[PDB]
Amino acid sequence: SRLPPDFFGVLVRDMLHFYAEQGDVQMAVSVLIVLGERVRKDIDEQTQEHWYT
């Protein structure tokens, strides 16, 4: 056994939104770039664009 495949998949998204709401987009963008593909298909396409710009 183990913890279920994606047990924390719903908390990294909340962390990213938590950091982006305060105005700290640096942390969100850096985490998005570092992680790469494990958090990618969870955030809407029009929010990543806003954060990057």
Binding site: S1, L3, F8, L11, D14, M15
Partner: protein, 264 residues
């Protein structure tokens, strides 16, 4: 008539890891312990300090490794990283946002707790609730907000510890039950030598002096002690422990074999 038909086969869960059953053609005892969420070995190897939590977490992580709890090594490491003294709350609400409001605090604690409640594992719940315990209307809301455990759910966190304590008592470990129960939030005539009065305590109330005097040592006893019920002479516990290890008379020359009167 009205009596039911005789029983001739049964099975009961006894102890903490045993099954007792008998069938029509003897009774046998089968150790059903690989069927339960709790574990006996972990209970023996789990430490729970109150001064150094950063060492408790790693010590338990190693113990979980020694048994094969892959899912638990993650949890203990996460608890290790999430309980540093560097994340201490501040008194002023305007200085900073608390760590509890962060999504990696209270919201992750409640995401582990519900999963283990579904799995029905008292051991991990009870050990996790113990580790994570450490105008003016606003300040009050801040004080309620800077905590990792919801202050409106204290009852559940306490009954977890209570049930685990009963389990540990069943297994046969009495020190580790007291250590666990120490975290529960809610609570559970010596004669004087100067005035010859019945005083309840280490200090007198009439002459304001020491009432108990060691019968080997004659330094006043303010801590732990033991005495004979009839002779009424005793003192520091280790003192009598050494004295009575080889003799059988009252140390003050009284004539009682207190080993036959003190011990029923």
């Amino acid at each position: 008539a009205n009596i039911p038909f005789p029983r001739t086969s049964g099975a009961r869960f006894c102890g903490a890891g045993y099954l007792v059953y008998f069938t029509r053609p003897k009774v046998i005892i089968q150790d059903i312990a690989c069927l339960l969420p709790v574990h006996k070995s972990l209970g023996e190897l789990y430490i729970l300090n109150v001064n150094d939590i950063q060492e408790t977490c790693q010590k338990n992580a190693a113990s979980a490794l020694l048994v094969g709890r892959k899912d638990l090594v993650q949890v203990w490491s996460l608890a290790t990283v999430a309980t540093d003294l560097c994340l201490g709350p501040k008194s002023d609400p305007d200085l900073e946002t608390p760590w509890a409001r962060h999504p990696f605090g209270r919201q992750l604690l409640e995401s582990l707790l519900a999963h283990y409640c579904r799995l029905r594992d008292v051991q991990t719940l009870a050990m996790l609730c113990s580790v994570f315990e450490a105008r003016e209307r606003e300040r009050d809301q801040h004080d309620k907000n800077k905590r990792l455990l919801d202050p409106a759910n204290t009852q559940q966190f306490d009954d977890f510890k209570k049930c685990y304590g009963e389990i540990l008592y069943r297994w046969g470990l009495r020190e580790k039950r007291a250590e666990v129960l120490k975290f529960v939030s809610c609570p559970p005539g010596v004669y004087c030598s100067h005035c010859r009065s019945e005083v309840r305590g280490t200090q007198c109330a009439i002459c304001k002096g020491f009432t108990f005097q060691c019968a080997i040592c004659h330094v006043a006893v303010r801590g732990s002690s033991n005495f004979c019920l009839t002779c009424g002479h005793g003192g520091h516990t280790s003192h009598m422990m050494e004295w009575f290890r080889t003799q059988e008379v009252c140390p003050t020359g009284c004539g009682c074999h207190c080993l036959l009167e003190s011990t029923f």
